[PDB]
Design a protein around this ligand. Structure first.
Ligand SMILES: CC1(C)CN(C2CCCC2)C(=O)N1c1ccccc1/C=C/C(=O)NO
Ligand SMILES: [K+]
Ligand SMILES: [K+]
Ligand SMILES: [Zn+2]
Length: 367
């Protein structure tokens, strides 16, 4: 009945010292607390993932290296480039403990869902969708989403992964590209040179998992109304075809107006509609964060979305709390779209939606 909120103060402090999103975890929790939403959720301390648990996806070689690099530094390991630790992923001290923590939180959340403790479980500090079995990528050192999905698989036969981060959820897709037991759906920017380069609509999966990857390439400047049309259209077709028994949902807020990535023009309202549409399915649902590099906007978003999970309307005025000054100059929860044009031509969108419709026919007709 009541949603699980994965949290400890240690877990947040550990996530706070992540490069490129400093003190983001704190800000997010701090604003959730300040709207008193934790009062209406079951707060669960996350476990730390054991090596065995992390080795369910990642290779022993990779985890071992990650561990070494974490204690010392980068300077006596030029082996690091082989395991994806470059400028994109710094080989900084402590990172193995951060990984194990994050992977633990997501595993814990999936465990809560197996046990019947809740229908919804939340870990906003997760969503590291780019990490590969033996390679870090795009500031993701460990694919917590994949670990959660593998945990959920103990109870739930088919699982749906939905990735609303700006970036293509490539790590997660890759991990399940050859299976039909997990369906991956990603909406993302797809443009020459834009990371990670993958996820065109023709990306459908391989072998037994052909048609059990979905990818919606979207261009700059999309806003709430159009994104939800696209999202609801695709998710309708997926629910019918795939009939999932559980859901993992990545809600990276780097789509939000005023993000440094400066690509989509979304507000949390729009993402909320997509969230609502998944929640009405009444399935076991694991909620994850991800990207989001305007930190205040990222906290506004994920707080607002916690609201929608609980069914509460939050007040426009931002409550006073530790980080009040970051919400300047207007000190409200709502985010205003930028005045940039929507580069998504409606013909090209209709071709994309139909192509996907057709791909999902093959899921039904080959059942
Ligand atoms: C290192 C960060 C993650 C931070 N960052 C900020 C800093 C300045 C403004 C953009 C990036 O562009 N990064 C990236 C660098 C290389 C590859 C990928 C990403 C983004 C990944 C992502 O969004 N996943 O959902
Ligand atoms: K995505
Ligand atoms: K798949
Ligand atoms: Zn992203």
């Amino acid at each position: 009945l009541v949603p699980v909120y994965i949290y400890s103060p240690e877990y947040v402090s550990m996530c706070d010292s992540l490069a490129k999103i400093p003190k983001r975890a704190s800000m997010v929790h701090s604003l959730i607390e300040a709207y008193a939403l934790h009062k209406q959720m079951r707060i669960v301390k996350p476990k730390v993932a054991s090596m065995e648990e992390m080795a369910t996806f990642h290779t022993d070689a990779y985890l071992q290296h990650l561990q070494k690099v974490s204690q010392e530094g980068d300077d006596d390991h030029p082996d690091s480039i082989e395991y994806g630790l470059g400028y994109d992923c710094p080989a900084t001290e402590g990172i193995f403990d951060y990984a194990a923590a994050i992977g633990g939180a997501t595993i814990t959340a999936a465990q809560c869902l197996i046990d019947g403790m809740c229908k919804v479980a939340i870990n906003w500090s997760g969503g590291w969708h780019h990490a590969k079995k033996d390679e870090a990528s795009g500031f993701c050192y460990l694919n917590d989403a994949v670990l959660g999905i593998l945990r959920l698989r103990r109870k739930f036969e088919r699982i749906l992964y939905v990735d609303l981060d700006l970036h293509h959820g490539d790590g997660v897709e890759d991990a399940f590209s050859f299976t039909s037991k997990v369906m991956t759906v990603s909406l993302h920017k797809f443009s020459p040179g834009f990371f990670p380069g993958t996820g065109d609509v023709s990306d459908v999966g391989l072998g037994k998992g052909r048609y059990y990857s979905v990818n919606v390439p979207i261009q700059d400047g999309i806003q709430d109304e159009k994104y939800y049309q696209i999202c609801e259209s695709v998710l309708k077709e997926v629910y019918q075809a795939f009939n999932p028994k559980a859901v993992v949902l990545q809600l990276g807020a780097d789509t939000i107006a005023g993000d440094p990535m400066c690509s989509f023009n979304m507000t949390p309202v729009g993402i909320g509609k997509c969230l609502k549409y998944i929640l009405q399915w009444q399935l076991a649902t694991l909620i994850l964060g991800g990207g989001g590099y305007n930190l205040a906007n990222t906290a506004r978003c994920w707080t607002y979305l916690t609201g929608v999970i609980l069914g509460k309307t939050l007040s426009s005025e931002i409550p006073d709390h530790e980080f009040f000054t970051a919400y300047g100059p207007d000190y409200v929860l709502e985010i205003t779209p930028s005045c940039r044009p929507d580069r998504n031509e409606p013909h090209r969108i209709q071709q994309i939606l139909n192509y996907i419709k057709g791909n999902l026919k093959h899921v039904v007709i080959e059942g």
